[PDB]
Symmetry: none
Subunit: 25 residues, 24 copies
């Protein structure tokens, strides 16, 4: 099993500084 | 089993500094 | 089993500093 | 079983500093 | 006639296990 | 006639286990 | 005639186990 | 007649296990 | 007649295990 | 008649295991 | 098993500095 | 098993400095 | 001048038969 | 002048038969 | 002048029979 | 002048029979 | 002048029978 | 002048029978 | 520090004339 | 620091004349 | 630092005359 | 630093006259 | 530094007269 | 540094008169 969601989204006129995304372990 | 939600969303005219997202363990 | 919600949302003209999101354990 | 809600919401013209969200254990 | 709505929606950071959708009869 | 609504909605950081939706008869 | 509403809504950080929705008859 | 809606939607960072969708009968 | 909708959507950073879609009967 | 929709969509950074799609009957 | 979502999204008029994405472990 | 999503997306009029993407381990 | 509001709202699981809306004169 | 609102809204699982909307005069 | 709104909205799992929309005069 | 809005929207799992849209006069 | 909007939208799993759209006059 | 919008959109898993679109007059 | 909210909102069938928004100083 | 929100929102069937938005200083 | 949001949004059936957006200083 | 959002959005059936967008200074 | 967003978007059935976009200074 | 977004987008059934885009200074 283990159906695992990740990151989904919309950035519209937005700002994001130094994101750290780890998909695992 | 283990159906696990992640991160879904909309950023509209928004600011997010140094997010840390870990999807696992 | 274990159907587990994550983080879903809308950021509209908003600010979020250094969020830490862990989806697991 | 264990149907577990997470975090859902709307941030409109809002500010949130250093949130810590843990979805697990 | 018979204008019949179905299923429309948004899943944001969410989990749904074994859904059964029947559009008919 | 028979204008019939279905299911419309938003799931934000939510969990739903084994839903059964029948649109008909 | 027969204008019939269905199910519309928002689930925010919520949990719903084994819902049964029948739109018909 | 019989204008019949199906399934339309957005899955953003989400998980769905073993869905069963039947469009007919 | 019988104008029948199918399945339309967006999967963004999402996971779906063993879906079964039948368009007919 | 019988104008019948199929499956249209976008998979972005997503995972789908063993889908079964039947367009007919 | 282990159907695991990654990162899917739209950047529209947006800025992202030094992102670190690890898909594994 | 292990169906694992990667990174899919659209950059429209956007800027991204020094991204680091590792698909493995 | 003449800043004039129109009709804004949410219909959730609701039914409305033969509405007549005129925005003008 | 004459800033005039129109019709904005959400229909979720709802039914509306034969609406007549005139934006003008 | 005359900045005039039209019709904007979301139909989620909804049904609408024979709408008549006139944007003008 | 005369900046005039039209029709913008989302149909998700919805049904609409014989719409008549006139953008003009 | 006369900046005039038309019809823009998304049909996701939806059905529309015999639409009549006139952009002019 | 007369900047006039037409029809732009996405049909995803959708059905549309006998549409009539006239861009002119 | 200084996590500062901006302007987030929904305008549904509404009218707003000559707004002046300054996000800064 | 200085995580600063901007302007995020939805305009549905709405009218806005001569807005002035300055994001800076 | 200085993570600064811009303008993100949806215009659905809406009208906006002579907007002035300055992203800077 | 200075991660700065711009303008991201969707115009659906909408009208915008003489916009002035400056991304700089 | 200075990661700066530009203009990203979708125009669907929309009209825009004499836009002036300057990306610089 | 200075990673600077430009203009990216989709025009679907849309009209744009005399746009002026300057990418520089």
């Amino acid at each position: 099993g283990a159906v695992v969601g990740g990151l989904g989204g919309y950035m519209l006129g937005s700002a994001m500084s130094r994101p750290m995304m780890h998909f695992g372990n």
